[PDB]
């Protein structure tokens, strides 16, 4: 009640390190927290659902923004079969010169990663042909997460 | 005093005890209530210390078991000799040893397994053997099969004699307790009689039989034209023509002008150019000297007469700076319990086996042995594994003694108490050493891998970027190379060709031996070896020291030696017994031995073994890629595991196909072991409950109610399957590679 | 029984070891075991090694109750010796721990209060659903 | 031959300093005064923590941003001409 | 531009240190 | 501190009291058995959870039950 | 006391070892923590300067040592952080010192103020200042 596991006094009384280890482990078991009722459990579940939706929308928006900013969508749409899609750029202080020269692929001017997710084809099929569309979609998804 | 004391007919031979199983223990003898009884009947069969408490019966049982083991060993030797005599190509291999592969087994023609009869050579088809028996027989002077048949018959006779002796000494005349407790006479007889006399007789055989026949063979004489061994003894003219010193007879030996025997007793050293092995004269000289040394050393302890030494007096009268009174009550402890002696002998035998493997690979003592690569590899790996297993067993028996035979009231020792009073510091220091060694040794490899993966080959720990050279080993190598010039004037050349410096020795177009270079890779692998050995030592020592009691459990000695746990309390007390410590150290012994054998195999294939053309260039099997590819884990995985496994997986449809099958089968067994190491008993018991219900519905319920295995039994099964699978995988891979490529 | 006191009892002959008291004894608590021996003899300490117990009264300091009880039960089983142990706190309070009624727990004694008794079979406990959303437990009822 | 006293428990439980020393300070008074006057601003704990965090972050960011391509191979970029894919992909 | 050279060190190093310090202080607090 | 409970199926064989390593259980007079006694667990705070009492108990199912609960210094078996 | 979990050995109890350890700045009880922390930080930074400049990624270029020196300073900062939090979670504002009160002989002595909020704060400040000064001195001596 006074230590880190505020939802469980029994786990907060012991002096060993397991109090930390179990504290992370039982944070989502709402039926184990002391002084619990049905109303509180249902409301916490509802709030967790909302948070999960926000996280999903933020993830999709980030993917769209990175593809727009550091990708080659406009070069890929013209020749789909002879262009390798790009996911995001690579910045690494540990890279040597051979790694920098060898990781440059596609039309990029620096090291990049090839996207095996398959979102280029999905976005091309539904009717996106420019970077502005991707930017608008990212903005809309950020608004939805908020 | 020293005397022969026996008891007449202590036991009566009858079959009444054969009918009832488990007669040794009353609990087992009562009868089977569940299936677990069966699993117990084999576990307590050889625990003589638990059947009774009198030392006399235990000693008699031990003596009889030793006799039975000797009989079994003699039977095995006789079988090997008979196979060599009947189904083998020894006579064909004798004439052309370089171009013929030894074989001593023939497979039947029932199913289609006749493809296993490969074309070994010499007009024969069979399985190529790697036991190295042909070289032993050649070095002994055997040139026919009748002698092998006679040896097999003699082995059979000796096995029968050993079995009869065991029966006689258990059921007719059994020695008393005072007979076994006489260690001075036993030591005198084992030193002077068993070792000195045997080596002296073998030296005599080598002088009289092996040397002339081997000289005739090395000259180029056909094996069918060599005179029989007894002709040399009967005809002194032949020996005079061979060695003129024999013309003088035994007069020089008593005349002390021993130089006349310099013809067949030499001190040259090195390898014989014709056969690629040690000189037989040097071997005979060494055996003679060893016989003299053992015969002299066998008269040290006082038995039945005034002259001699007392072991108890030597131990008690010992005074030193760090020791003090020290060894006061060790004699009673060593002469009271069998387990301490068993542990000491097991550790010594394991160390001796490892030393034997090293000395045997370094200096080949048999003719045409260095140029046969499979035999060398098999001998090295086998002896290393045996030594590791013995070293592991020593700690288990030490823990058994400390658990069940230690009492500080009647038999008290100061050194053991002093060691037991500060175990925490020892354990902490060993833990720190293990952590430090592991961190450095593995971090070097991980750093090399990361630097190579980032396109930075100039930042690695290699011979080109950052050099870590074994300076001390190189200094020792140079000293050994320069040894015979000034330090050892008697020897013409150095003991071994391994030392950096000298010439190359090759026999029949194949390299026999050449100096071995040392670099950064050897440094890293040696440190890895040290780390693994230290971790195994830490595990075994922690198991041995904390057997009686611990801070967590203050009364661990009451529970015994083989108990699963104490309970779910105290946070959990699983695997607290010393048996669990041994079961855990088995894994680390396996790991260490696997790493050692991998290092030896790759280094020997890369830097020593190979072929020589007429011009004088040497081409190695893997072309010397050890020094640049073994500094990273990816190199070990690609240039050793991936590259050298081509032969084993492509052996289907050929005479090596069996090996390939094993390369799969062992794998399966390994995975099977996991089932016994990741689960628990309750799930299996609850499943057997439903299975038993399904049986009960159809009136097929057995009286012996099925029960799941105990925890200790499950752990033992898991570790046994793991070890067997891993060892069989390594065996199949090594044999397939070294037979297909060498 | 009235609790006793341990004013100035001596200690057995020990050479010292690393299995002794730690910071918990100075911070939290420790335990003291006292017995009486008729002759001088050697026994085995729970912390490792052997010690010698002087003839007469003997006192010893340990870290946990399990060590005290193990030593006491070994003494009773082997030497036939009566013993008793207390628990000592940093503030100086000494609490009598071993037999509180003056007799060993394995012997039934009148005037003893019963704790933790449930007058039902082990299979008569209610299901966990019946005690849901309350601070009690099924076995407590 | 006694080791348990109820009046005091520091000796009974072993509360000692093995290597503690109570000797006066050997440092020169002038140097001590100089160090005391000059090291004063770092005495406070929260201020020290905030200053350390902010200064470390700002310095690391400034050094990373201002760094040139000679020190960092990543900032230098590729130099060789590009390469084609396995199936002719760009 | 040069945004990665400013943002990668921030997320990689500074933020984990701040989060670790805050979490350790909150956990150890009584 | 763990929870130790005793049920009325006990027959007063005194094995659990002897098996306890921390002196948790004792025996009291009773009325509903031939032995005229029953076990009890007053010193619950000293329980460690070894479950030796359950190991030594003759019944169809144990008349003494141990349920693990909130841990402390004593129940964790710590000497440092 | 034979019943305390510690043993007496020549290494752990010798006049030379005792004198050398008691004269170390970490054991001077009477001195205020700032002067001890300054010396500790100076020594630690001066030692730490070396390996970074001798085995750094840029150790072969002309910038090498300078860069290495910077790295050393950074480490000191991190170490200072690792000190500050250790105080905050350990010592409260009003609690007294928790150091042992009596010496080995048995004499009552004043407890060390290092195990206090103000004492630890002074120690950390002195350590930071001394570490920075030592790093700067090592760099100046090595590359001037
Ligand atoms: C485990 C051992 C290990 C070791 C020894 C090294 C060593 C090295 N690494 Mg590698 N590395 C490792 C594992 C290891 N690595 C692992 C697991 C990884 C992750 C995959 C890496 C990844 C890596 C990277 C990414 C880089 C390196 C690089 C380097 C070098 C940088 C050294 C440095 O700047 O800090 C040294 C700092 C110190 C403070 C030294 C502390 C040790 C002192 C000397 C203690 C000695 C104690 C003394 C005896 C005490 C006695 C007390 C008495 C006086 C009273 C160095 C040669 C860098 C490189 O470029 O080098 C070419 C580099 O960029 N390493
Ligand atoms: C997550 C992101 C991340 C990032 C961006 C870095 C970044 C860097 N690493 Mg680190 N590292 C990380 C995670 C990360 N690391 C992890 C997870 C590990 C464990 C495997 C390491 C282990 C490691 C090693 C073993 C080495 C590095 C080194 C380097 C540097 C390489 C650049 C160079 O070539 O030297 C250019 C020259 C320099 C010495 C830079 C000097 C200036 C620095 C940035 C200090 C600025 C001081 C400032 C007060 C820092 C403290 C503030 C605090 C908030 C952090 C650079 C600072 C190398 C190094 O620092 O050398 C000793 C190196 O040897 N790193
Ligand atoms: C060390 C133990 C040993 C081992 C493992 C073997 C192994 C083998 N023996 Mg050998 N053998 C041994 C000792 C041993 N022998 C001894 C001591 C003798 C002397 C009596 C012989 C005499 C011998 C003969 C005469 C023959 C074999 C043959 C065989 C093979 C088939 C056996 C068979 O199918 O029996 C069937 C099983 C039962 C009757 C039951 C098998 C490889 C056979 C062979 O290889 O034929 C091609 C065969 O003809 N052995
Ligand atoms: C000089 C005579 C002598 C010899 C040759 C031996 C030799 C041996 N003893 Mg020792 N021993 C001796 C004196 C001798 N002992 C005395 C006086 C005592 C009483 C103190 C003992 C007490 C003793 C015990 C308690 C044990 C041995 C064992 C052994 C065997 C070890 C197994 C092995 O290493 O493989 C080497 C293998 C061979 C060389 C086999 C060859 C067969 C030998 C030559 C048999 C003839 C030996 C015998 C002493 C002579 C026969 C006397 C009898 C006919 C009247 C080996 C046969 C151990 C054993 O294995 O038990 C069976 C064992 O448990 N010995
Ligand atoms: C030098 C000889 C030697 C001797 C005489 C002993 C003697 C003894 N040992 Mg020790 N021991 C030794 C070496 C030796 N040990 C070694 C090298 C190790 C390390 C592994 C051990 C480890 C050890 C343990 C872990 C234990 C003992 C125990 C015992 C006692 C019981 C023996 C038993 O019941 O087995 C009877 C035989 C068996 C149960 C057979 C088991 C099946 C084996 C494991 C399979 C091997 C399979 C085969 C190689 C592969 C082919 C497969 C094919 C069959 C399909 C006995 C006094 C036991 C004890 O209780 O001591 C008080 C005990 O728990 N020993
Ligand atoms: C390959 C996997 C594996 C690994 C890595 C380990 C590792 C270890 N074992 Mg375990 N073990 C394993 C499998 C493994 N085990 C299995 C299958 C068993 C059979 C049950 C056991 C049973 C066992 C026993 C019985 C014992 C150990 C012990 C040890 C430790 C040895 C001391 C030492 O070397 O530490 C040094 C560290 C390493 C070798 C681990 C790798 C570290 C590398 C260099 C990375 C470091 C990089 C860097 C710091 C990471 C930072 C990045 C982060 C900031 C993001 C070590 C933690 C021994 C022990 O604990 O005593 C000390 C011991 O007694 N093990
Ligand atoms: C440091 C260790 C060392 C070792 C292990 C050896 C070992 C040996 N010496 Mg050498 N020797 C050494 C240093 C050493 N020597 C030094 C410093 C000198 C100079 C005085 C010699 C001079 C020397 C002579 C003069 C002889 C040997 C001989 C021998 C061999 C027979 C030993 C024996 O007499 O019984 C043996 C290989 C003997 C020999 O070579 O016979 C084969 C012999 O005659 N040694
Ligand atoms: C949703 C998940 C998401 C994920 C996994 C990533 C992942 C990544 N980002 Mg992106 N990013 C996202 C959303 C996401 N981003 C959003 C919503 C924005 C708009 C503010 C950005 C803008 C952005 C920038 C400006 C940069 C990255 C960079 C990076 C890389 C290094 C991490 C970093 O520096 O953090 C930076 C994190 C943020 C600025 C916080 C955004 C959180 C929300 C508002 C990594 C590939 C770096 C890079 O390009 O390296 C090559 C970089 O410089 N990202
Ligand atoms: C291989 C084998 C075998 C065989 C074996 C054999 C064949 C053996 C032999 C052996 C022998 C055959 C031996 C011998 C020995 C001898 C001896 C041991 C001797 C001695 C001597 C002496 C000691 C002397 C002395 C003297 C002197 C010094 C001087 C003068 C006087 C006199 C003479 C007395 C068998 C089948 C079994 C088994 C299997 C394997
Ligand atoms: C390691 C090993 C092995 C091997 C072994 C061997 C090889 C052995 C040998 C052994 C030997 C090789 C032995 C020998 C012995 C001998 C003897 C024991 C002798 C005796 C003698 C005598 C007794 C004599 C007498 C006499 C005479 C006759 C004359 C003069 C006088 C007199 C009296 C002196 C095997 C593989 C199995 C495996 C396991 C391990
Ligand atoms: C698989 C498994 C079992 C189950 C294993 C069992 C029941 C062994 C079964 C062995 C044989 C196959 C049973 C039958 C043996 C008879 C000899 C069969 C006679 C009939 C003919 C075949 C001759 C455990 O009991 C267990 C216990 C603890 C930890 C892990 C495990 C575990 O992993």
Order of helices and strands of chain G, N to C? HHHH
Largest sheet of chain G: none
Structural class of chain F: alpha+beta
Helix residue percentage of chain F: 10-25%
Number of strands of chain F: 4
Gross geometry of chain F: elongated
Query: Largest sheet of chain F, order of strands side by side?
Result: 1-4
Major sheet details of chain F? 2 strands, antiparallel
Structural commentary:
This is part of a larger assembly, with 7 protein chains of 7 kinds. Chain B is mainly alpha-helical. In chain B, 59% of the residues lie in helices and 3% in strands. Chain B has helices spanning 16-19, 26-30, 36-43, 48-51, 55-86, 90-95, 133-140, 146-171, 177-180, 183-219, 229-234, 236-242, 251-255, 280-297, 311-316, 330-336, 338-362, 373-404, 414-420, 423-453, 471-481, 483-487, 520-545, 556-559, 578-607, 626-629, 633-642, 646-649, 657-677, 681-696, 711-741, and strands at 6-8, 103-105, 127-128, 173-175, 505-507, 510-513, 610-612, 618-620. Chain C has 141 residues and is an alpha+beta fold. Chain C is 14% helix and 24% strand. Chain C has 2 helices and 7 strands; from the N terminus they run H-E-E-E-E-H-E-E-E. A 4-stranded antiparallel sheet of chain C has the order 4-1-5-6. In chain C, strand 2 and strand 3 form a beta hairpin. Chain C is elongated, with a radius of gyration of 20 Å. The two termini of chain C are 34 Å apart. Chain E has 30 residues and is mainly alpha-helical. Chain E has 1 helix and no strands. Chain E is rod-shaped. Chain G has 144 residues and is mainly alpha-helical. Helices cover 57% and strands 0% of the residues of chain G. Chain G has helices spanning 15-22, 33-55, 64-88, 117-142. Classes of the chains: A mainly alpha (146), B mainly alpha (742), C alpha+beta (141), D mainly alpha (90), E mainly alpha (30), F alpha+beta (80), G mainly alpha (144). Chains in contact: A-B, A-C, A-D, A-E, A-F, B-C, B-F, B-G, C-D, C-F, C-G, D-E, D-G, E-G. Residues 73, 197-198, 201-202 of chain B line the site of one beta-carotene (BCR). The PDB classes it as photosynthesis. The entry lists the keywords PSI-lhci, Arabidopsis thaliana, light harvesting, photosynthesis. The entry is titled "Cryo-EM structure of Arabidopsis thaliana PSI-LHCI wild-type". Chain A is Photosystem I P700 chlorophyll a apoprotein A2. Organism of A: Arabidopsis thaliana.
């Amino acid at each position: 009640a006074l230590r880190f596991p505020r939802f469980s006094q029994g786990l907060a009384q012991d002096p060993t390190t397991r109090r930390i280890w179990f504290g992370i482990a039982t944070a989502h078991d709402f039926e184990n927290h002391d002084d619990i009722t049905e109303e509180r459990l249902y409301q916490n579940i509802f709030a967790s659902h909302f948070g999960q939706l926000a996280i999903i929308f933020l993830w999709t928006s980030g993917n769209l923004f990175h593809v727009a900013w550091q990708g080659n969508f406009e070069a890929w749409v013209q020749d789909p079969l002879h262009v390798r899609p790009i996911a995001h750029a690579i910045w690494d202080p540990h890279f040597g010169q051979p790694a920098v020269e060898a990781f440059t692929r596609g039309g990029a001017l620096g090291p990049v990663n090839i996207a095996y997710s398959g979102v280029y084809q999905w976005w091309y099929t539904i009717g996106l042909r420019t970077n502005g569309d991707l930017y608008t979609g990212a903005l809309f998804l950020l608004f939805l997460s908020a | 005093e020293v005397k022969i004391l026996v008891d007449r007919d202590p036991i009566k031979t009858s079959f009444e005890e054969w009918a009832k199983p488990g007669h040794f223990s009353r609990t087992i003898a009562k009868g089977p209530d569940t299936t677990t009884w069966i699993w117990n009947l084999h576990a307590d069969a050889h625990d003589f210390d638990s059947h009774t408490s009198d030392l006399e019966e235990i000693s008699r049982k031990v003596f009889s078991a030793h006799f039975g083991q000797l009989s079994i060993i003699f039977l095995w030797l006789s079988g090997m000799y008979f196979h060599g005599a009947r189904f083998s190509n020894y006579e064909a291999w004798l004439s052309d040893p370089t171009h013929i592969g030894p074989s001593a087994q023939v497979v039947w023609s029932i199913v289609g397994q006749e493809i296993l009869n490969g074309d070994v050579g010499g007009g024969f088809r069979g399985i190529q053997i790697t036991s190295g028996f042909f070289q032993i027989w050649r070095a002994s002077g055997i040139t026919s099969e009748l002698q092998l048949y006679c040896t097999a018959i003699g082995g059979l006779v000796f096995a029968a004699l050993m079995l009869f002796a065991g029966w006689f000494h258990y059921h007719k005349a059994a020695p008393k307790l005072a007979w076994f407790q006489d260690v001075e006479s036993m030591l005198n007889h084992h030193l002077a009689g068993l070792l000195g006399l045997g080596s002296l007789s073998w030296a005599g055989h080598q002088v009289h039989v092996s040397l002339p026949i081997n000289q005739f063979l090395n000259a180029g004489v056909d094996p069918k034209e060599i005179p029989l061994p007894h002709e040399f003894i009967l005809n002194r003219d032949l020996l005079a023509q061979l060695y003129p010193s024999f013309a003088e007879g035994a007069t020089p030996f008593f005349t002390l002008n021993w130089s006349k025997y310099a013809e067949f007793l030499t001190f040259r050293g090195g390898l014989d150019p014709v056969t690629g092995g040690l000189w037989l004269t040097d071997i005979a000289h060494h055996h003679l000297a060893i016989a003299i040394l053992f015969l002299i050393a066998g008269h040290m302890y006082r038995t039945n007469w005034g002259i001699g030494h007392g072991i108890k007096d030597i131990l008690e009268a010992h005074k030193g700076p760090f020791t003090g009174q020290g060894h006061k009550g060790l004699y009673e402890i060593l002469t009271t319990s069998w387990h301490a002696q068993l542990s000491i002998n097991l550790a010594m035998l394991g160390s001796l086996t490892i030393v034997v493997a090293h000395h045997m690979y370094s200096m080949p003592p048999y003719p045409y042995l260095a140029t046969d690569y499979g035999t060398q590899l098999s001998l090295f790996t086998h002896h290393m594994w045996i030594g590791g297993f013995l070293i592991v067993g020593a700690a288990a028996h030490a823990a058994i003694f400390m658990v069940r035979d230690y009492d500080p009231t009647t038999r008290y020792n100061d050194l053991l108490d002093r060691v037991l009073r500060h175990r925490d510091a020892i354990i902490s220091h060993l833990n720190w050493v293990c952590i430090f060694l592991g961190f450095h040794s593995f971090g070097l490899y991980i750093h090399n891998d990361t630097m190579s993966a980032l396109g930075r080959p100039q930042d690695m720990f290699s011979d080109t970027a950052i050099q870590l050279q074994p300076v001390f080993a190189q200094w020792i190598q140079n000293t050994h190379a320069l040894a015979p010039g000034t330090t050892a004037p008697g020897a013409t050349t150095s003991t071994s060709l391994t030392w950096g410096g000298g010439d190359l020795v090759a026999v029949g177009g194949k390299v026999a031996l050449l100096p071995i270079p040392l670099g950064t890779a050897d440094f890293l692998v040696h440190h890895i070896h040290a780390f693994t050995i230290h971790v195994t030592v830490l595990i075994l020592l922690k198991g041995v020291l904390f057997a009686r009691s611990s801070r967590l459990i203050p009364d661990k000695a009451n529970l015994g030696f083989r108990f699963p746990c104490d309970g779910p309390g105290r946070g959990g007390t699983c695997q607290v017994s010393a048996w669990d410590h041994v079961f855990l150290g088995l894994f680390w012994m396996y790991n260490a031995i696997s790493v050692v054998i991998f290092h030896f195999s790759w280094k020997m294939q890369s830097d020593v073994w190979g072929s020589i053309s007429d011009q004088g260039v040497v081409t190695h099997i893997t072309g010397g890629n050890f020094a640049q590819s073994s500094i990273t884990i990816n190199g070990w995985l690609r240039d050793f595991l991936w590259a050298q496994a081509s032969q084993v997986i492509q052996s289907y449809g050929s005479s090596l196909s069996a090996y390939g099958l094993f390369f799969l089968g062992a794998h399966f067994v390994w995975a099977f072991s996991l089932m016994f190491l990741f689960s628990g008993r309750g799930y299996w018991q609850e499943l057997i409950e439903s299975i038993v219900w399904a049986h009960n519905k159809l009136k097929v319920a057995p009286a012996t109610q099925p029960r799941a295995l105990s925890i200790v039994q499950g752990r033992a099964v898991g570790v046994t399957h793991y070890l067997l699978g891993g060892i069989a995988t390594t065996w199949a891979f090594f044999l397939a590679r070294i037979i297909a490529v060498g | 029984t009235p609790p006793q006191l341990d004013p100035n009892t001596p200690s057995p002959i020990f050479a010292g070891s690393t299995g002794g008291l730690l910071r918990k004894a100075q911070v939290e608590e420790f335990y003291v075991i006292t017995w009486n021996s008729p002759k001088e003899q050697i026994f085995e300490m729970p912390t490792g090694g052997a010690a010698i117990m002087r003839e007469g009264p003997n006192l010893l300091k340990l870290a946990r109750k399990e060590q005290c009880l193990a030593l006491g039960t070994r003494l009773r089983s082997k030497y036939k010796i009566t013993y008793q142990f207390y628990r000592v706190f940093p503030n100086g309070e000494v609490q009598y721990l071993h037999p509180k009624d003056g007799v060993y727990p394995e012997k039934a004694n009148p005037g003893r209060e019963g704790v933790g008794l449930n007058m039902r079979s082990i299979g008569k406990n209610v299901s966990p659903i019946e005690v849901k959303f309350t601070g009690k437990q099924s076995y407590d009822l | 031959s006694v080791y348990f006293d109820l009046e005091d428990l520091g000796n009974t439980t072993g509360q000692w300093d093995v290597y503690g020393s109570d000797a006066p300070s050997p440092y020169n008074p002038l140097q001590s005064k100089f160090f005391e006057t000059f090291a004063a601003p770092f005495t406070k704990r929260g201020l020290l923590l905030k200053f350390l965090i902010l200064g470390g972050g700002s310095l690391l960011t400034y050094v990373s941003a201002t760094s040139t391509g000679e020190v960092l191979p990543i900032k230098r970029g590729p130099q060789e001409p590009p390469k084609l894919g396995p199936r002719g992909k760009l | 531009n040069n945004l990665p050279s400013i943002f990668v060190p921030l997320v990689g190093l500074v933020f984990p240190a701040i989060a670790m310090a805050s979490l350790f202080l909150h956990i150890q607090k009584n | 501190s763990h929870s130790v409970k005793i049920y009325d199926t006990c027959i007063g064989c005194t094995q659990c009291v002897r098996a306890c390593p921390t002196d948790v259980l004792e025996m009291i007079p009773w009325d509903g058995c031939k032995a005229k006694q029953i076990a009890s667990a007053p010193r619950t705070e000293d329980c460690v959870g070894c479950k030796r009492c359950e190991s030594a108990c003759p019944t169809d199912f144990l008349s003494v039950r141990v349920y693990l609960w909130h841990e402390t210094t004593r129940s964790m078996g710590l000497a440092y | 006391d034979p019943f305390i979990g510690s043993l007496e050995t020549p290494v752990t109890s010798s006049p030379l070892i005792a004198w050398y350890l008691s004269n170390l700045p970490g054991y001077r009880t009477a001195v205020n923590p700032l002067l001890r922390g300054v010396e500790v930080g100076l020594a630690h930074g001066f030692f730490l300067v070396g390996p970074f400049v001798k085995a750094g990624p840029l150790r072969n270029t002309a910038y090498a040592g300078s860069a290495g020196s910077l790295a050393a300073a950074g480490l000191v900062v991190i170490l200072s952080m690792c000190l500050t939090i250790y105080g905050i979670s350990s010592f409260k504002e009003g609690e007294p010192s928790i150091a042992p009160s009596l010496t080995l002989t048995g004499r009552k002595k004043q407890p060390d103020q290092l195990q206090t909020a103000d004492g630890w704060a002074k120690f950390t400040g002195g350590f930071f200042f001394g570490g920075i000064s030592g790093v700067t001195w090592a760099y100046f001596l090595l590359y001037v």
